[PDB]
Amino acid sequence: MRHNKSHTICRRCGKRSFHIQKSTCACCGYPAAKTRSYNWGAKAKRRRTTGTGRMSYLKKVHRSFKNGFRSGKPA
Amino acid sequence: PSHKSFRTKQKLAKAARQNRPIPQWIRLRTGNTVHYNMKRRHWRRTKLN
Amino acid sequence: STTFRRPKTLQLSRKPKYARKSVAHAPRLDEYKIIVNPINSESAMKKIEDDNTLVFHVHLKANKFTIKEAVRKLYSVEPVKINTLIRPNGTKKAFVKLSADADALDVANRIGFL
Amino acid sequence: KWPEYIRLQRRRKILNLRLKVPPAIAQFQKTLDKNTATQVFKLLNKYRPETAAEKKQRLVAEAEAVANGKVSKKPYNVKYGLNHVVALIEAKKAKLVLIASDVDPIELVVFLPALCKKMGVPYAIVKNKARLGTVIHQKTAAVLAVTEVREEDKNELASIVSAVDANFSAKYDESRRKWGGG
Amino acid sequence: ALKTFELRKQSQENLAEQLQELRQELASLRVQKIAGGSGSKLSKIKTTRKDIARILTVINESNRLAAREAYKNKKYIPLDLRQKKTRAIRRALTPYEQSRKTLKQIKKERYFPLRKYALKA
Amino acid sequence: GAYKYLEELAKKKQSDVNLFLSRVRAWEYRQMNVIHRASRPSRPDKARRLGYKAKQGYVIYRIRVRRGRSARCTAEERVGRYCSNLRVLNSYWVNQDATYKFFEVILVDPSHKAIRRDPRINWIVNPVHKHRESRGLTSIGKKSRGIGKGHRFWLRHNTLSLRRYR
Amino acid sequence: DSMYSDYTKRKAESDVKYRVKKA
RNA sequence: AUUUGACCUCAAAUCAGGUAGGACUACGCGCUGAACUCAAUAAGCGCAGGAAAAGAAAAUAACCAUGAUUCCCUCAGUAACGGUGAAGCGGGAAAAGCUCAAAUUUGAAAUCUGGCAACAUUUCUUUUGUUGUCCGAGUUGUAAUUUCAA
RNA sequence: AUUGGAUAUGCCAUAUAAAGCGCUUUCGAAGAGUCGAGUUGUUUGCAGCUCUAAAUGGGUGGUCAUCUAA
RNA sequence: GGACAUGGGUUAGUCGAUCCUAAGAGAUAGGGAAGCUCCGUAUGAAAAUCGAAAGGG
RNA sequence: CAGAAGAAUCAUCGAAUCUUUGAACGCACAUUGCGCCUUUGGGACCAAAGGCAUGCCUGUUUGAGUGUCAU
Ligand SMILES: [Zn+2]
User: Fold this and answer.
1) CA distances from D18 to C11, D110, F141, G8 (A)
2) E57 shares a domain with E2
3) What is the CATH number of the domain that holds F101?
4) Are the C-beta atoms of residues A11 and A29 closer than 8 Å to each other?
5) Domain that holds residue E121
6) Which of D9, E118, E120, F13 has its CA 20 to 30 A from that of F97?
7) Which GO molecular function terms does the record list (chain A)?
């Protein structure tokens, strides 16, 4: 008798938390523009905060900053 | 079922690759604690959800 | 005397002072990426000499027109039918049935995977 | 049904002609007569300020004259700008005052008729700010003031001042204390 | 592998043809891997992949320098050719307009600037 | 200068002329939108003394807010949110009726070169002035939060400072 | 005048919905 | 008749050029705000920066007077209120002052964005400007002088 | 390889100008639904609402002293 | 052995989805709210979309 | 391990690439669903490249107005 789904995979956050009838993710709040976050969920914030991913651009910016954001080609 | 979507199939595809045995040569490397699989799932056991 | 609709103003096209991208991007779906590898499993090998057909592992973005153009530009062999499926591991496998003029064995020999 | 912008465009007009207008505003929709207005603008056409091109030509001409071998005549033009005109009224240097009848914020011109009368300056309300704008090579001129002309134009300047007196001060002279509108 | 500098002293079409034959060779190398090849071929797969990457790199560089030459000394250039430090630095005030001063302040700094003085002990 | 006359007339808000103009203008803004552009300010004297110059970069928006928090502060916040590329310079009351108070908000375009090259307004381009109307750094914002100089106008108590040597 | 009279006539039925209190 | 040209208002454009969103949030500024003085706390909402905010008195004082703001010791657990709880002065850390509106350049809008063409300059072919020309903004006021210490 | 500021040195600038100082035989413009009052709400301060200012005036402290808000 | 290890296996113009819409959800123009946002979707505008692998095809 | 042999799973890092998404931006997305504009290529069709979100600001163009006017 348990062969129906309440939530599905979320497009934005890739978890099975996107409700079907309400059409809003319980985890990240998609389709809301702002990502769902609550200060009482300190652990919930640190599971999805920055640094849990690749941070590909931020590492690029940090190495760039350490040299004063120079451009061009050396001698 | 036999009516799955593409996204469901693709998620199934990598979930089938994840639960495969580890090659022996990577175990034989030095400083490599990897000697078994701790992400081994079985279909009758825990569901993918 | 009714339906005061908008007057028709001319629609000036875009006249940019600069292109939004400095250089154009080369075609991202070329025949080399379309045809990845051929399958040489025994079932495919049977199809080779029992149906004048070659089994290719194609890119997952490829559509029947594209493999048709890709094999034609990479082998100059004229296909008659293409059938595509997606394997359970998430890879597209294409059965290209050639015309009776070409021989699947000769094509397989010249590719080098018989 | 007409768009809301043109509905409000017509509705503002009807209400302005419908409501009880205090005399300080009621004095504005009574303006100068036709022929006097044409003679006003005929006189001001002579004394319109020099254009930017004419100014630049004069500036380069005097600059090269000074540079090569070497002071000009007294300029004669109409005086524009609200503050500059108000200053001229304060100093009594202005001889004739023209106020556009359709200034958008009416408080910008509501105090002028009282001020010119206090200084005894001949003032008149003329039609449309656009005409004053073309006179001074502008889009909009809220007020114009004539303070000095050439000697040969003094005779007819006195005549038009008498004419505007007759058609604006001898005539009317009651709308400034009459509850207009309604 | 091909040296990047001698790749630079060639023309566009030659790099295009070298690219095309490299892709033929890579396709041949991969089918050898599928059908069973020697360790030399399996190792040659990586080096030929890197050499196509070199040719793509030099082609893209030559195109971008060409575009920079085309847009040299122009008010507006493509957003790819424009600088990218940060969004904040791009939106910030330039040093010229941070140094802009009213004529009042110019006179003040002309006539009463920070003087150079000292005290005798 | 006529702005002295404009200012002195604005003092007397119960005058017959001001009452007639206010009713007609307030009626006009009613069938206008809640927030609408005003190409030229309705009180040029007030706008100039509040910091508005008739140059490319300054924007005047008229907003109506119902009565019954500070209406001037609410007007600034709503206009600032509605024009997100503009810094709210200041605002001033223009009109009122039984239920609607009308305000005109002066905004500045930080991206415009006529603003970025003017040393007398360049301070607003700095990123520290983003959404001043929301942080409470405007004139009505400062007055509402009670910022002032004098005995009339918390963290120093809820902490117990423990020095090294004690 | 005719437009406003028509406006009132339609508002009498179509745009009634005044009832300005929604909790 | 009606055609022609202005100004005002309002539109439309895949028009030219720009800008806002979202994320982090320890510190910063606001709105809002409980319950078991709790607490202007926690939660909720908005918005920034490297600091934020505050800041050059519509300030203290009743002295031989002090002199922008911020922080620290002290005042002091005092005044005050009915357990809450300052501030002036004094000693230090740091110091820096200023800008507009309100008056006519009226013998001259002297002001400014943008388009076009050159000249340049660069953390940089990626940056920032200069001049000339055109259009526009602008007299419903942009420049210079003035901010009460004057 | 960059620069940050000064020193020496070269070249342009255009001052027919601008500014500081002592006197007046002079005038001295100064921010409004804002201050303020009554009432209700929040922890004097702030806000809602009725009403609504002045120009040696207005605010603050016990005629005087000190400041000059919006 | 359905467990473990190594491989192979799902081929569509005609079968379905995709198309349409029902109950319903909801963008937009406007109106509120200190605000995240609620009403509004045929509505006083210078003109939708989603929703059925058992419905229609 | 095999393998060839300016090497390297080296460091630095100013030149580039950066797939599908996501504030996410042609419309949608429990769908590898549905489009439109420009150009090019292929032997009507297909393919490829470049584009099409919203609000706001400055300017440009076209308008709309029995709104005010001048002939
Ligand atoms: Zn999610």
Assistant:
1) 43, 20, 41, 21
2) yes
3) 3.40.1120.10
4) no
5) 76-121
6) D9
7) RNA binding; rRNA binding; structural constituent of ribosome; zinc ion binding
Task: Please tell me the total count of domains within chain B.
Answer: 1
Subunit contact C111:E31, Cβ cutoff 8 A: yes
Instruction: Give residue for tokens 């009626």.
Output: F27
Question: How was this one solved?
Answer: cryo-EM
Picking from D63, D82, D64, D62, the residue whose alpha carbon sits closest to that of residue D72 is: D62
Q: What is the rounded CA–CA span in Å between residue F17 and residue F29?
A: 18
Tell me if B37 sits within 8 A of B21, measured CB to CB.
yes
Decide if F127 and E91 are in contact by the 8 Å CB cutoff.
Answer: yes
For residue F166, is it within any domain? no
| C37/E30 CB distance under 8 A | yes
Range of the domain at F137: 2-145
Strand pairing report for C92-98 and C53-58: antiparallel
Within residues 38-57 of protein chain A, the ones with CB less than 7 A from nucleic strand J are none
Q: Are residues E1 and E51 in the same domain?
A: yes
Residue D122 near residue D165, CB atoms below 8 Å: yes
Asked if residue F159 is part of any domain, the answer here is: no
Which domain does B38 fall in, by range? 1-49
Place of tokens 């004095």: D27
| E67 shares its domain with E100 | no
Neighbours of ion ligand 1 (CB under 5 A): A 10, 12-13, 25, 27-28, 30
Write out the two tokens for C6: 């908008």
| F70 CB and strand I closer than 7 A | yes
Q: What is the DSSP letter of D49?
A: P
C-alpha–C-alpha distance, residues A9 and A16, integer Å: 4
CB-CB neighbors (< 8 A) of D1 in chain C: 4
On whether any CB of chain F is under 8 Å from the CB of E92, the answer is yes
Q: d(Cα A43, Cα A49) in Å, to the nearest integer?
A: 10
E59 in the same domain as E94: no
Cα C46 to Cα C32, C39, C41, C108: the distances in Å are 26, 11, 9, 12
Expressed in angstroms and rounded, the spacing between residue E86 Cα and the centre of ligand 1 is 29
